[PDB]
Symmetry: D2
Subunit: 359 residues, 4 copies
């Protein structure tokens, strides 16, 4: 019985994390998804939601439904590639979930409701050993970004952790290479051109806390403040205070792009920065940061499981002739997919390090 | 002048019924809107929502927000073109609204939660006299359709009424003319190509009772069943049981089209049908059934306030040469705008009638 | 002996034919694609275009480029899993094409500029033996639809043929089943809700031969006349003069749907038609007509290779209870994709019939 | 004293220039648009194009057509507010156009074919005295931006001029205030989030000069290099070589946004830049630069006739706290509409100076 995982919340977020783990060949062999929790109990509806994705395509594993015991009123178990996964109804308090009863040690917290560390602590109270929140968190709760600071994970200090946000997983790797290769970042402003999300609205509606955010998403360019760039200060502490940014939400189904403008801490050139991103992508950042030097458009990154894919041609063509300090770096991300794979990545690293803490 | 109306539901259909009421020029004069009820009190947000509409342009009446009470909090009063409108909060049960206090007889029920007649009766119990449900109603409730059967309204029998759906308001006028002109309708199947609405999702979401309906709205053609053709059978009783249809939700912001195929009861031609539609549009259906003989696309009907706009070119060019019974009729509708007007249109109707049943 | 194919026009439909072939593992076994002819000569552009597709995803095979001879400046040769394909420069006169010089016997003509039989006959003067026109043709070219009338191909008479259109290929199989099984078709009118195409415009532009068709495509529902349903009259002679239709162009990037309404020649029921279509898809229309009984939306048909995919839940839910004559049949098609696989299928049919016709 | 205008090209940009002129109430009054020149001469089609606009709504003037003479089969004259506009046939050479004959003094060159100053100088041989190119020009044509350097117009030396691009007209007013008010620009990088335009494709098409630019426009984010920021150097020579930028083409049909990142020449703050922007907009930039402090989205700028509308909240909320040198400025533009009114503003300014010159 390998790593024992539970997913709390089985909306699009939980769903895409599950399929990211099936995609990396982890189901039933490296990770056991014991259960999934949601307010919906219709397993046939979940199976359907898992089989067809308007942007990602067709799930490649068969998904059937069954009954945990012949008593049960209706199917409550999803069967994915042979593996039985139980559906459990959602609780107001995570401390009520039957984590312990189930044998689950790691909880992927994807509901979006238990983003504060002490709210998220409830899962450990219910029997779980570790919680990975699949969004930014508050109340402290180590924020960890794979390929950037994930070695700061300390098995019994960090029980409840944040995998950050999809925008921060795109930008952090770029900033990380800029700092690690010696260019440094004195000041930087980030603009993310963002595909719509599920908190947006088909037609102008009501969004009291974000007035622009409530307007019709598929026919507008909608500005929004965002915390992703300031959040990079948690994972790359030298940048606190030096970086902030904004989003413009645009009418594409998925795939987003970061437009980073920044002043380097030493004289350099867009060419040396471009060679360092490529070198990093092939070595220490492999699987987290890639680059393209082709003429790609957003559709071409769909299903890319890298966190950040540097656009070499867009970057080399639109920077200032012989500039030594003031540069623009363009990098893409499949806002839904790379992040999901990183959630799984973070869960495995933690497990690996946890098991190591017992050796 | 008088006529006291209160809109329950200040969401998108309520503000559009409200703006439909202002554009023409009835706020305060022949109609005085006194209060609006909604789950939010922010009056400042409400004014922002009224002022900017992605599809319909900018409201052309100035709107402000003053206080009404020292001691409660911010504002709660809309001031549109010199008229004060008060925002009250919503309550689980409709018989808590101060309709008598405020002195509102006619209530435009638009929240979507009180479609069952009995719930609509609640406003009666709150001091209001008559009620117009701005959606297809149930529990029994006279379904009136301006231009078709509205003049069936009985001030003594009908207190709670439903103005049907925007789709039924586009279909029933065409069908009315086919029946009234003696073309007859033996059998018919309608297809409505409908812009996406607010019950839809930007990305693949959760939609339990309509699996297709839960899929990503602005990148898909989404088929749906609809009761709008069956509803024509309640309003034009000779078609009862002979009509049905479906919907295809497509990625456009507003404006929909009815694609009606039908078998006439006797021998005709599309040219006689076409003449008869044009002739009624200029007469007995004038203001309700309009037509176009131009090369229009759905953006050309934005803000058209007819209920149904017959496309003569599309109908004449796409029918079988020499056919006598089997016909296709195409008609457009700004699903938002036209209907909004029809609600205010109905409201006046009854005011003109039910006065003269009290007087 | 691999049949030697040449593709005139290496625009979208030519590419998609090529992709369809590689996928079926035919390239270099049953078919040798010797050359693609187009106005552009840039093999590296062709390779870019083949690699990335915004709707169909990344091409899963490796594409590289080479030089036919060292002389040649830029690459003029596409290489796919070792299969070498010469990029030849288009000619205003197809008779100057070097088909004979290349040993090409079958030309797939997909530029849309040689759809007249007499113009496409220029390929034969160039050295080809047979031409398949990948659109509706004129001047008396035999029109063949796979699974419907393709056995009417006659090797000694039919040298330039038409594979009809994508819509004709979705519609025709439905009508064939109806007519073949004895339900029959007395009258019928089709509506296609179609994804926009390359002929359309991004913003309101110029289109003097289709006024509506020049308006902005991704924000409008755009009506258009269409010869698809009438063309069914050429492939299924008994339907001549009984069927016509129209199109509505909607803002989805790919995947379309036929909304057929018809009067059957005998008394039936929707249940009986539904059962026939499913049986036929499983047997004599296998590979041509598929069905679904799932809750699918347009994106779920992307890359479906069938010509027509009958929607059983949409058909069964939106028809008249107990009706015996007047019906609605819903069927999908990936307008691009199913049709390109049929082009390939027609070519193989033709090559087998030609081989049998000589010895 | 009305000036005599001719419009070369009556495609969308020429049409929007003529609509802007009309909207400013100039038609017949200050300006005699004598004729429009295009490959189409069907006056009925131009009437239809002008009457309906998917993005800008219905023309506010009535458009009818007539014939220059009785024989004129197809009408060839457009009539707005009883002003007659002759539709003349486009020529391969501007020098062969009949401007002297017609008495045209100013030609608005909008085809995009004659952006080379010496190609646009053909109009002069045709009988015109001045040419305004409604695009960036090459070959030494003087580039004039209203509100920034338009008083550099020199009647005796500038005969063929450029009104720059819609992007340059949005940026230059912003850089112009920074420089004029003493903040200065040491270096700047601009990103424009632009609406798709008529050069893009509905589906992946052919675009040998811009590989990315040939990809499906309404479902992609499409990077593109751009000359707009560097061109700011021709209008404010002090920024020569200090500015450059890029575009991301997104699937909105109109309205774009400039996201400028720059480093100021001396310490300042985002509050002082904001106050200067706002103050210039009420004074010397009035009508050219506007601002909003409301929660606006792109559709709220449709039909805004400014060149640049500074977004105060999006600017003030998304900069680095206490920053003295490194800032972001956000400004919107209706890319069609603002620029079209600037084309007319530039002709009326040239006419006043040429008028004053002769004295
Ligand atoms: C657009 C105008 C009005 C009358 C407001 C309107 C409302 C409306 C609401 C729903 C719908 C179709 C509709 O069509 C319309 O025309 O399908 C939905 C479900 C509930 C999925 O069946 C809910």
């Amino acid at each position: 019985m390998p790593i024992k995982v539970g997913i709390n919340g089985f909306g699009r977020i939980g769903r895409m994390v599950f399929q990211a783990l099936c995609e990396d060949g982890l189901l039933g062999t490296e990770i056991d998804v014991v259960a999934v929790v949601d307010m919906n109990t219709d397993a046939e509806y979940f199976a359907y939601q898992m089989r067809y994705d308007t942007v990602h395509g067709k799930f490649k594993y068969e998904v059937t439904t069954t009954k945990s015991s012949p008593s049960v009123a209706k199917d409550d178990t999803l069967v994915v590639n042979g593996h039985r996964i139980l559906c459990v109804k959602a609780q107001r308090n995570p401390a009520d979930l039957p984590w312990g009863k189930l044998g689950v040690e790691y909880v992927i917290e994807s509901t979006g409701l238990f983003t504060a560390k002490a709210a998220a602590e409830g899962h450990l109270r219910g029997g779980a050993r570790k919680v990975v929140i699949s969004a930014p968190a508050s109340g402290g709760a180590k924020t960890l970004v794979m390929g950037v600071n994930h070695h700061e994970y300390n098995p019994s200090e960090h029980h409840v952790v944040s995998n950050a946000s999809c925008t921060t997983n795109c930008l952090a790797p770029i900033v990380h290479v800029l700092v690690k290769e010696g260019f440094g970042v004195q000041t930087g402003l980030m603009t993310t051109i963002h595909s719509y999300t599920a908190t947006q609205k088909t037609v102008d509606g009501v969004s009291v806390k974000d007035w622009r955010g409530g307007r019709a998403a598929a026919v507008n360019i909608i500005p929004s403040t965002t915390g992703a760039a300031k959040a990079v200060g948690m994972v790359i502490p030298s940048t606190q205070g030096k970086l902030t940014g904004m989003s413009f939400r645009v009418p594409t189904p998925d795939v987003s792009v970061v437009d980073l403008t920044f002043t380097a801490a030493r004289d350099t050139s867009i060419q040396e920065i471009d060679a360092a991103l490529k070198r990093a992508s092939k070595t220490y950042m492999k699987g987290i940061l890639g680059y393209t030097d082709e003429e790609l458009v957003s559709a071409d990154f769909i299903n890319d499981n890298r966190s950040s894919i540097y656009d070499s041609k867009a970057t080399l063509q639109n920077n200032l002739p012989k500039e030594r300090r003031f540069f623009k770096i363009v990098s893409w991300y499949d806002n839904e997919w790379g992040y999901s794979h990183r959630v799984v990545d973070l869960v495995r690293h933690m497990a690996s390090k946890d098991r190591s803490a017992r050796l």
